[PDB]
């Protein structure tokens, strides 16, 4: 119920409950169970796409992700179908640590890991938002109006799973960072 899988320091509910139930629904089965069972989730958040189909974002412990990666496509396919009208995906909760000041104080708290920096984390978010494709490259555009836009290049193959999504990834990303993201396709070295 709420207790097990919606935990991570808060019980709660509603959607988390629905999705969890959906996972159980999937759980009845074969190899489409036992493999999942281990997987667990911290929380779910829902945020929309501009005309109005919402996207559902799921949070993972991070040690878990390799396994989630293991399934992903098949699971997402199920969650989109059972829960339709939403774009489902998977993001790992990452900690982020503040850069020390100085007088922040500083009781030289244990170093911290780049694998804890806000930029690194955000990069991870970008990496997580798209899936099996791969981010081929990136560029940053400085708009006349002091604005910045990040062009995130994408692979080509197998993309289709993401193609329809793109707009949500942009919106979702915004909700998290407040930065603007855009997507593109390549090229194929020759």
């Amino acid at each position: 119920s709420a207790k097990i899988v919606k935990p991570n320091g808060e019980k709660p509910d509603e959607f988390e409950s629905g999705i969890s139930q959906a996972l159980l629904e999937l759980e009845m089965n074969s190899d489409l169970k036992a493999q999942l069972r281990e997987l667990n989730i911290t929380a779910a958040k829902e945020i929309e796409v501009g005309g109005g189909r919402k996207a559902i974002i799921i949070f993972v412990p991070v040690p878990q992700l390799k396994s989630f990666q293991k399934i992903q496509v098949r699971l997402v396919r199920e969650l989109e179908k059972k829960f339709s009208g939403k774009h489902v995906v998977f993001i790992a909760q990452r900690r982020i640590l503040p850069k020390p000041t100085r007088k922040s104080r500083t009781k030289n708290k244990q170093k911290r890991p780049r694998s804890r920096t806000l930029t690194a984390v955000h990069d991870a978010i970008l990496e997580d938002l798209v899936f099996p494709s791969e981010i081929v490259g990136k560029r940053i555009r400085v708009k006349l109006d002091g604005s910045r836009l990040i062009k995130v290049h994408l692979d080509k193959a197998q993309q289709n799973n993401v193609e329809h999504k793109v707009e949500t990834f942009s919106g979702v990303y915004k909700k998290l960072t407040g930065k603007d993201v855009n997507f593109e396709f390549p090229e194929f070295q020759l």
């Binding site: 990496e127 791969e134 981010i135 081929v136 490259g137 692979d155």
Partner: protein
């Protein structure tokens, strides 16, 4: 460009972007770490392990299929040897040049070259020492160097 000559030559790896992959790469961390350790048993250097792994068996970079550089893998198993390999091959090279110069006292080129090599060694050791790898007070000496490299 270059340190002990006027050579310009740009030349390199050119390492790949793609964050992940290879994808056509199955195997596993398990697999190649075993592979690495077994090769290092045989006496192979990390450069050498990386090459042979690269060409014979699928490993584009050992880093990517395992979050660790080959040397770090070796050291963690307990395969790290006494001085870093670059320093080794330098010391060994200055040895072979030194042996050749003892044979042929008439070769001024060789004497020049020996100096160059030796300077490169002393600076490298200064760097390793600054960085704990070598005990502060480490030095390379002709006398003892011969005995050191083998």
């Amino acid at each position: 460009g270059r340190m002990h000559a006027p050579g310009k030559g740009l030349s390199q790896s050119a390492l790949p972007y793609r964050r992940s992959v290879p994808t056509w790469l199955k195997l596993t961390s398990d697999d190649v770490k075993e592979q690495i350790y077994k090769l290092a048993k045989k006496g192979l250097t990390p450069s050498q392990i990386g090459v042979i792994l690269r060409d014979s068996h699928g490993v584009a970079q050992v880093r990517f299929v395992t979050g660790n550089k080959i040397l770090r893998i070796l050291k963690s198993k307990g395969l790290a040897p006494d001085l870093p390999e670059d320093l080794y091959h330098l010391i060994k090279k200055a040895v072979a040049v030194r042996k050749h110069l003892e044979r042929n006292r008439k070769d001024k080129d060789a004497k020049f070259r020996l100096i160059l090599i030796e300077s490169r060694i002393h600076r490298l050791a200064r760097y390793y020492k600054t960085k704990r790898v070598l005990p502060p007070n480490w030095k390379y000496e002709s006398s003892t160097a011969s005995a050191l490299v083998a």
